[PDB]
Amino acid sequence: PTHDVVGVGFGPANLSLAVALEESPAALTSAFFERRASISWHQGMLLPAAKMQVSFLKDLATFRNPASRFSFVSFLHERGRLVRFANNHDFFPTRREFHDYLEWAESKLAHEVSYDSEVTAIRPGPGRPVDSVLVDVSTPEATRTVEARNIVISTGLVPRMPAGVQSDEFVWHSSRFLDHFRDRDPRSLRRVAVAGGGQSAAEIVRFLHDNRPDTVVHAIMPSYGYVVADNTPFANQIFDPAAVDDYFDGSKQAKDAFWRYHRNTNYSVVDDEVIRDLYRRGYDDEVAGAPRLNFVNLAHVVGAKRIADDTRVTVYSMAREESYDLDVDVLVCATGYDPMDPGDLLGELAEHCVQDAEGRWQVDRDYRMVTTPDLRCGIYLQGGTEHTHGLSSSLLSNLATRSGEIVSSIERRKS
Amino acid sequence: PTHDVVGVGFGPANLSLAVALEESPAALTSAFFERRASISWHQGMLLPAAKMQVSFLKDLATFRNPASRFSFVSFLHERGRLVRFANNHDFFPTRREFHDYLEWAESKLAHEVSYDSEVTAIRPGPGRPVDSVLVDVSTPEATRTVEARNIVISTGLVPRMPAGVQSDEFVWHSSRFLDHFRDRDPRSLRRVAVAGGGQSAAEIVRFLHDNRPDTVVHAIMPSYGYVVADNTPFANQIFDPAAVDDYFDGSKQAKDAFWRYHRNTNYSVVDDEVIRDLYRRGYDDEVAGAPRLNFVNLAHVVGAKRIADDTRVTVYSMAREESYDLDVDVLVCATGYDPMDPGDLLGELAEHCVQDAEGRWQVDRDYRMVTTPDLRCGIYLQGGTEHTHGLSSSLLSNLATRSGEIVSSIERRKS
Amino acid sequence: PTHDVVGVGFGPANLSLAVALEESPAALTSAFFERRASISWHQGMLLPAAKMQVSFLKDLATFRNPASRFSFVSFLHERGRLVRFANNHDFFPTRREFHDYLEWAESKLAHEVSYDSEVTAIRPGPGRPVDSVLVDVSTPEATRTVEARNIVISTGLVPRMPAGVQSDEFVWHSSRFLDHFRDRDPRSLRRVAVAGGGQSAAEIVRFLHDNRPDTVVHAIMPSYGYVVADNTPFANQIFDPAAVDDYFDGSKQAKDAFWRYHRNTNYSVVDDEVIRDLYRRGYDDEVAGAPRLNFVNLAHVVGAKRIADDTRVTVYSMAREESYDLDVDVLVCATGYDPMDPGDLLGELAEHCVQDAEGRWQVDRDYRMVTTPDLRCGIYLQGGTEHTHGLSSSLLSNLATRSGEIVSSIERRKS
Amino acid sequence: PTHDVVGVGFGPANLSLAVALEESPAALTSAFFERRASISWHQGMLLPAAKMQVSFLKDLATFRNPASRFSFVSFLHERGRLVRFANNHDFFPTRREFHDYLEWAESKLAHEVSYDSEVTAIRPGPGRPVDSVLVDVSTPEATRTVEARNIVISTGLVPRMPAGVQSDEFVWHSSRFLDHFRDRDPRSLRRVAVAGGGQSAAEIVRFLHDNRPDTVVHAIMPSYGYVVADNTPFANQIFDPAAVDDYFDGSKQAKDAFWRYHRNTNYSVVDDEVIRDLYRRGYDDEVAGAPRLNFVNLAHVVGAKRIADDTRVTVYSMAREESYDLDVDVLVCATGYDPMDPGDLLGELAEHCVQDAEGRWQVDRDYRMVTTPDLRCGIYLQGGTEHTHGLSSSLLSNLATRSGEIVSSIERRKS
Numbered sequence A, B, C, D: 001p002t003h004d005v006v007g008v009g010f011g012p013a014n015l016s017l018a019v020a021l022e023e024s025p026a027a028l029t030s031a032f033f034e035r036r037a038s039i040s041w042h043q044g045m046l047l048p049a050a051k052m053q054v055s056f057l058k059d060l061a062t063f064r065n066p067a068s069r070f071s072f073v074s075f076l077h078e079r080g081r082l083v084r085f086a087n088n089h090d091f092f093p094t095r096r097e098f099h100d101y102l103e104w105a106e107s108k109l110a111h112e113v114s115y116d117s118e119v120t121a122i123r124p125g126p127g128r129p130v131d132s133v134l135v136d137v138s139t140p141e142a143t144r145t146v147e148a149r150n151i152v153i154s155t156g157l158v159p160r161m162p163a164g165v166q167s168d169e170f171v172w173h174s175s176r177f178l179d180h181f182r183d184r185d186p187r188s189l190r191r192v193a194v195a196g197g198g199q200s201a202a203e204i205v206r207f208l209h210d211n212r213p214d215t216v217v218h219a220i221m222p223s224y225g226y227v228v229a230d231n232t233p234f235a236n237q238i239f240d241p242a243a244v245d246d247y248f249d250g251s252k253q254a255k256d257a258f259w260r261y262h263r264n265t266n267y268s269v270v271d272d273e274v275i276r277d278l279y280r281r282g283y284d285d286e287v288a289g290a291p292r293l294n295f296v297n298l299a300h301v302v303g304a305k306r307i308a309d310d311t312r313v314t315v316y317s318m319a320r321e322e323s324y325d326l327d328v329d330v331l332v333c334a335t336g337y338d339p340m341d342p343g344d345l346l347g348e349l350a351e352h353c354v355q356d357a358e359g360r361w362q363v364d365r366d367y368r369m370v371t372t373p374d375l376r377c378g379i380y381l382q383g384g385t386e387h388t389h390g391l392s393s394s395l396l397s398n399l400a401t402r403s404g405e406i407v408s409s410i411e412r413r414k415s
């Protein structure tokens, strides 16, 4: 039984693909594989106050189909919270509510997702040229292999730690903050260091300050202070569907300009409200004569070691150009993520995937990896296209349009 | 040919009724009659800057049907402005754009509206009890009569002038501001008085200030300054669909409380941004040494007379408790509207319509006038239900839910 | 030793009087008497998040003297927080910081305030006509009497409870919220009812929600939802120094208009941010499936009784027009305050004080009570002048100007 | 008659110096020379809507002296606009009001400034080592020379045009926008090109759009859209007085970090409100079917030439990577400014001034140029210190503190 398309990973990207497949008139067969037990959308960072960084109109389908049964508005309506939400006049739902949206959409979905199923490899199907791929799926019980004419790889970002620092029972990446935090005695985290100047670092510091009144926090970051995230309307147009074409069709020189001028829309920046909330907290503590938030600016974390009952963090100060040690209970590294890379999974298919001058995968406008003739099945990327398609590639900004374009591409090449 | 339902008037209310009819599985026959040549939604007040006072989610259908082809989101999508609109992150469209939305929806509607068709009267059909009404329609060419089992009256508000003051060549109600203003030669309106402290008055004064740099404006209002319109989320719940039930089922005492505490959500109040903009304008003029906006507070316009080349406005000052004269070119009365009243159109049928203690029409929860057993046909009101259904009755707030309720009521009764 | 002026009470009002006295070139002798041990500015309501409802520019002196050593800006500067405060770009300090400002100003003040000194009575001095008053002061040790030519009464508002409800171990007025709350055991206040729809009620509910995750709160209020406080710039002009003259010189008709149109600036209304924060809290709880905030609208608390371990609150529902019982641990009445009334402390002198038609004290523009020729000494009111001077009379809005006018009046009479 | 200090230029910087001199107890003699007829603070850009980019608390003196007679608050008070301003609740005055503030402060100043006086050169005084400088001043009538022990150079920024584009009758730098614009027949500027993505470009485009309804505007800028200016509170701390020490004492590596992370606080960025206003304007025009604003993004102006009645602008597109011609009536270059450089004026004295590795002037913490022992007189820079003192050097952010430090330095060295 050969599938038209197999989806690796079931995050918002492949979920929107599933929605696009269902809404398409095209009769396409599909299977989706998620390693986790259920949809799990950055749950390590599902902090109490956390807000979406994208408007509710940017959901699973709305920009492609303005009357989708899978829209956020449909969700609110079924949950009897549309009127309430509307009264709030805020475009940004909580991360918690959006997670419920994802689960709700997955349930409404006709197709049944295969959970606890880790794709361990993708191998060429029989033939030359290769017209199908073999997908190795490892469940808790057995292992199996499915065959598909197309694959869509959407396995998400991979946590990035600072150069000389390894995850530990006392050094956590921000992606696994709540995982470790919940398991911990309250009075076993009175001193916490958080490295980074982005949204994650800011949200964790805010949470720590608000969670206990005694916790002392050291926010270590290279900038002189948090930099604001730009989502003013003109700059925000880089997230437009049409901006994908501008980026894709533009010269390397234009592509560079996107990053040079608009990196501050997405990376190493913090939402206005979070910055201001942190600043008020610091101010009020000063008034009260009880400072707890220590902003260690113009600085990098360069090492961490466990010494008795302390986590010894080595901090490099750019101002003085020297290192020193900071003793805390826990070091949280909110130091970001590296992009999705299909290379690992593609194993030997990769040989046939054409690279560019930089060493990156060549991808067509329709998100399909460029291959030699020796390979003829479709390999589509949702994620890992920051160099070809631009800043929206790993975001929720353009799920609706990308998923639709991929389905169309698949229908057209089967067509 | 007897219609299930005839609609009198084609504003947003009956338009949403038409949409509800089309979306309903029920096979109901209908006809709609609008006097004007086309949809005309307060065009006299379609000022350059004017913004909706209602969220875009409160459109023709969305609260009833979250995936309607007639939703504002569908409209934006079709116009290729959805992405642009989203980037703006504002829930409130311009009045200009909403007008286009109405026209767009009317065009998409399968049914064909009858324009240039004034309903002059509604008369009882043959038989006793009366099972149908006869609707007299006057076109430019002929006159005709149509028969219906139900009618829905949605003829809108009626302009209310100050007591001693009549519309004239130099005394305009705000509802006809642009009608008169465009027909004037600029420079013949160097001195304008605007009476009122509500959104209309504020918008007109702002427009006048911005339109020409030399115009002198007298803003005459009873309050000490503009009062802000409350749309904070808890108070804004009075506009909820469910609030209709709370108001309807509540005692007169409760009904009174709605008005006592929340009149400032809708009447005699001004949007925050408009107030702030007016204040900045006045402040900068002061800095420049060229004041043009004169706020005449704690005051009422009590008369107007034409004397040579001057419109003489008589102003009563509450502070000094005395009247005085103000000479201007034009007096604009932004003094509000009276509610829709179905009594004139009803004529003979009114005898079978039951009134309450206060002499107002009794209306059922489903917007159907209460009648004696002599009348079996349905008379539904969209508008004129402020005393039975509450503050949303004449607003865009609840079009989707009311229209659906009426269609359901008609379907239910159809035997 | 006869003083030019004695001040009864040492809150912000008399504090600004002290400042005006020190800054005045006039050589006036004074004494101030405060019952409490130190300045105590609504400490029972000094909640963690609480923010001033007045701009920092409205401090002890700034509107009168733009370069006062007692300005809030001077305070910030001495506390090394001016730059930090400026970076925040918020006109509204915390109540906590403002309290600190008051104490700071009191210290910087040359004059020494007499604390733990309750003024028990004011009696006429010797002679006829009366040229001085005798002020009876009760300290913890002894009692004494001082003599003064003028007296300024600024004893503050008096807590108002609902009719038929008395303060008790389990029924608290909002003014004494923190007093009682700090003194209970956190696990003993799992169910709290808060009566009222104003700033106090809102702030207490917010605090309760944020303080513990399990507390269940019933917010009982007559309106359908919190009403927003108006401080938009035109309406806000009722707090202007000049507005005092408009109100004072205006007819009763005009005075009524101030209250009719602008009560929503000050009474029974809540700050925008607090309303929105409460609404987000309620929304997120619903998403989480753990509702804790119960808004009991269109309702009054009419009785409270202790029954075993429950405080049984009798609630009247306007909608149903019937009472019912609500069992909680504690009832907090955030039901407001009655104005300052000099009558009680005046005793014998009150006969020579002239009343108006409505039975309230007549007061001159300079805040001096109108007396018969029998009294020649000056009795000045800071507070209790809402009927003569308007809504700013009991607020921080106009401390600088009023205090200056009183000092001037005293200097002028002496002369 | 040898002066303690001579000030070259009379902008806000030297004005704050004059204020610091007057407020200082030190008896220092001074003279100030301004080439313009009066204070002239970027008048070519005094557009109708233009707002200050700095809080009113950052004025001539307030951060140094919180009760200065020259504070903005003192100014508002004198102008009888303090209460009005406070009601507005906006920290940012208009540029127009701030200009009045500067004139007001100059008038209040005891010292009298010499206008129409261009400093053409600074020469060494007699003796070795040099203990004084000779300042050559050229008035309209005569020329003269004054002698001083110290000199403060504050001659402001110098306009920077795009490479290969010269100012002309139809090519204007933004700094001279209103100069040219007022001298032009309104019907002669139908087509305008504005080059740049910063505050100036944005302000000019908004002005053009608002000034005439038919003007077509081409906004040519290298970014994909306007980038927002960061003034959120943590990043804004780079403008703090204390931040000057952090920057000054910090290593080159730290200095670089300031620019790398926080250049978006000051250069090539636009105020939030201006961006959103522009976006609304563009949106409404699209709704109306009359687009007038053309955003030419990812592009540079590389040439301009007059050809008949067309100003021919050559535009380089980074995307397509090709230059094309754009025909307009006028080209406005809002392409920024180069820093103040004392080199030109110093002439012979530069021989005793020390340069750093990069060839820039070495400056001490107290704004005094580093010299050899051959020169003993003080040369102070207000401006041109972006490399030693940081981003605030050419801004209004730190006038009060810098001016005070310079006066102190001078007093200390005369001692």
Ligand SMILES: Cc1cc2nc3c(=O)[nH]c(=O)nc-3n(C[C@H](O)[C@H](O)[C@H](O)COP(=O)(O)OP(=O)(O)OC[C@H]3O[C@@H](n4cnc5c(N)ncnc54)[C@H](O)[C@@H]3O)c2cc1C
Residues within 6 Å of the ligand: A008, A009, A010, A011, A012, A013, A014, A033, A034, A035, A036, A039, A040, A041, A042, A045, A117, A118, A119, A120, A154, A155, A156, A157, A200, A266, A336, A337, A382, A383, A391, A394, A395, A396
């Ligand atoms: C806290 C936070 C941090 C973020 N960091 C960044 C950032 O640094 N840069 C940026 O541009 N955006 C970032 N985002 C955006 C983030 O990428 C999206 O929001 C979203 O999850 C992307 O959707 P996705 O479906 O592509 O990937 P994901 O949601 O991450 O989903 C991938 C799914 O695939 C599964 N999976 C992986 N491998 C396999 C396998 N072999 N077999 C089966 N299943 C597999 C995973 O378990 C996961 O469920 C962040 C958002 C959050 C909230």
Ligand SMILES: Cc1cc2nc3c(=O)[nH]c(=O)nc-3n(C[C@H](O)[C@H](O)[C@H](O)COP(=O)(O)OP(=O)(O)OC[C@H]3O[C@@H](n4cnc5c(N)ncnc54)[C@H](O)[C@@H]3O)c2cc1C
Residues within 6 Å of the ligand: B008, B009, B010, B011, B012, B013, B014, B033, B034, B035, B036, B039, B040, B041, B042, B045, B117, B118, B119, B120, B154, B155, B156, B157, B200, B266, B336, B337, B382, B383, B394, B395, B396
């Ligand atoms: C400037 C302005 C002022 C407003 N004033 C108020 C106010 O004071 N209070 C309030 O609560 N809301 C007010 N509104 C809201 C307003 O009611 C709605 O926005 C909207 O018009 C209501 O929809 P409707 O369809 O019920 O009435 P409508 O939009 O008014 O239209 C009714 C239609 O029926 C037609 N008609 C009338 N008589 C006949 C007839 N005999 N035969 C055939 N056709 C007929 C009319 O031509 C009209 O097109 C105002 C809105 C604006 C923009």
Ligand SMILES: Cc1cc2nc3c(=O)[nH]c(=O)nc-3n(C[C@H](O)[C@H](O)[C@H](O)COP(=O)(O)OP(=O)(O)OC[C@H]3O[C@@H](n4cnc5c(N)ncnc54)[C@H](O)[C@@H]3O)c2cc1C
Residues within 6 Å of the ligand: C008, C009, C010, C011, C012, C013, C014, C015, C033, C034, C035, C036, C040, C041, C042, C045, C117, C118, C119, C120, C154, C155, C156, C157, C200, C266, C336, C337, C338, C382, C383, C391, C394, C395, C396
């Ligand atoms: C929580 C809260 C609630 C408020 N409620 C209202 C309201 O309902 N309406 C309104 O308009 N404004 C209200 N305000 C404003 C309030 O009145 C002021 O902010 C402020 O306290 C006014 O100044 P006073 O100096 O007039 O103050 P009062 O501060 O309250 O201070 C008077 C002082 O006199 C002392 N005193 C009293 N009697 C004697 C005596 N016999 N002998 C010696 N000392 C005595 C008292 O101990 C007190 O310290 C409220 C503010 C807050 C923070």
Ligand SMILES: Cc1cc2nc3c(=O)[nH]c(=O)nc-3n(C[C@H](O)[C@H](O)[C@H](O)COP(=O)(O)OP(=O)(O)OC[C@H]3O[C@@H](n4cnc5c(N)ncnc54)[C@H](O)[C@@H]3O)c2cc1C
Residues within 6 Å of the ligand: D008, D009, D010, D011, D012, D013, D014, D033, D034, D035, D036, D040, D041, D042, D045, D117, D118, D119, D120, D154, D155, D156, D157, D200, D266, D336, D337, D338, D382, D383, D394, D395, D396
């Ligand atoms: C529209 C605009 C653009 C701006 N551009 C920038 C920018 O690009 N980067 C940035 O960081 N900040 C910029 N600013 C800030 C601007 O520098 C300050 O607000 C302010 O003018 C600086 O104060 P100043 O007195 O140091 O210089 P100026 O205000 O410019 O004053 C210098 C004075 O010296 C006079 N002068 C010059 N030479 C002589 C001479 N030989 N003899 C006598 N007098 C002389 C000048 O005519 C002038 O009056 C800008 C502000 C505005 C409003």
Ligand SMILES: NC(=O)c1ccc[n+]([C@@H]2O[C@H](COP(=O)([O-])OP(=O)(O)OC[C@H]3O[C@@H](n4cnc5c(N)ncnc54)[C@H](OP(=O)(O)O)[C@@H]3O)[C@@H](O)[C@H]2O)c1
Residues within 6 Å of the ligand: A045, A050, A051, A052, A053, A095, A162, A163, A174, A195, A196, A197, A198, A199, A200, A201, A203, A220, A221, A222, A266, A267, A268, A269, A299, A300, A301, A302, A334, A335, A336, A337
């Ligand atoms: N509520 C939400 O939806 C939510 C929550 C979190 C994140 N996100 C999104 O996810 C994306 C990533 O955000 P992120 O905050 O997780 O990561 P991020 O934006 O990449 O930021 C990483 C930060 O760590 C810094 N850093 C790197 N190495 C360091 C070291 N050795 N010591 C100290 N600091 C170091 C980086 O500095 P440099 O700039 O010098 O590299 C940067 O400030 C963003 O687009 C964000 O908006 C969304």
Ligand SMILES: NC(=O)c1ccc[n+]([C@@H]2O[C@H](COP(=O)([O-])OP(=O)(O)OC[C@H]3O[C@@H](n4cnc5c(N)ncnc54)[C@H](OP(=O)(O)O)[C@@H]3O)[C@@H](O)[C@H]2O)c1
Residues within 6 Å of the ligand: C045, C050, C051, C052, C053, C095, C162, C163, C174, C195, C196, C197, C198, C199, C200, C201, C203, C220, C221, C222, C266, C267, C268, C269, C299, C300, C301, C302, C334, C335, C336, C337
């Ligand atoms: N952080 C601060 O600076 C701060 C904090 C608190 C207060 N304040 C100020 O102090 C002033 C007073 O505010 P306030 O909140 O304390 O009082 P209000 O006087 O403003 O509050 C009274 C409220 O309780 C209601 N109420 C009265 N009797 C009731 C009953 N039997 N049952 C249920 N509800 C009842 C009132 O309803 P009705 O309107 O129908 O009578 C009203 O909603 C305001 O100016 C306020 O801004 C400032």
Ligand SMILES: NC(=O)c1ccc[n+]([C@@H]2O[C@H](COP(=O)([O-])OP(=O)(O)OC[C@H]3O[C@@H](n4cnc5c(N)ncnc54)[C@H](OP(=O)(O)O)[C@@H]3O)[C@@H](O)[C@H]2O)c1
Residues within 6 Å of the ligand: D045, D050, D051, D052, D053, D095, D162, D163, D174, D195, D196, D197, D198, D199, D200, D201, D203, D220, D221, D222, D266, D267, D268, D269, D299, D300, D301, D302, D334, D335, D336, D337
């Ligand atoms: N209301 C006010 O007080 C006010 C008004 C205006 C300005 N200011 C202040 O003055 C400072 C400077 O503002 P500014 O806008 O005058 O200058 P600016 O910030 O230096 O901006 C100059 C802009 O022109 C661009 N550019 C340079 N060459 C170009 C070319 N050949 N073609 C097209 N674009 C070109 C620059 O691009 P690149 O990014 O690639 O360099 C940059 O976007 C700011 O700090 C600002 O806030 C204040």
Ligand SMILES: NCCC[C@H](N)C(=O)O
Residues within 6 Å of the ligand: A053, A054, A055, A058, A230, A231, A236, A239, A265, A266, A395, A397
């Ligand atoms: N970090 C996510 C930013 C999302 C982007 N501003 C958007 O609106 O699409």
Ligand SMILES: NCCC[C@H](N)C(=O)O
Residues within 6 Å of the ligand: B053, B054, B055, B058, B230, B231, B236, B239, B265, B266, B395, B396, B397
């Ligand atoms: N005057 C219009 C009021 C609209 C109302 N706040 C609503 O959101 O429905």
Ligand SMILES: NCCC[C@H](N)C(=O)O
Residues within 6 Å of the ligand: D053, D054, D055, D058, D230, D231, D236, D239, D265, D266, D395, D396, D397
């Ligand atoms: N471009 C001027 C920036 C001013 C800066 N935000 C400050 O507060 O000093």
Ligand SMILES: [K+]
Residues within 6 Å of the ligand: B021, B022, B023, B024, B025, B026, B027, B028
């Ligand atoms: K139908």
Ligand SMILES: [K+]
Residues within 6 Å of the ligand: C021, C022, C023, C024, C025, C026, C027, C028
């Ligand atoms: K004195």
Ligand SMILES: [K+]
Residues within 6 Å of the ligand: C106, C107, C108, C109, C110, C111, C112, C113
């Ligand atoms: K003292």
Ligand SMILES: [K+]
Residues within 6 Å of the ligand: C107, C108, C109, C110, C111
């Ligand atoms: K003292």
Ligand SMILES: [K+]
Residues within 6 Å of the ligand: D021, D022, D023, D024, D025, D026, D027, D028
């Ligand atoms: K001096």
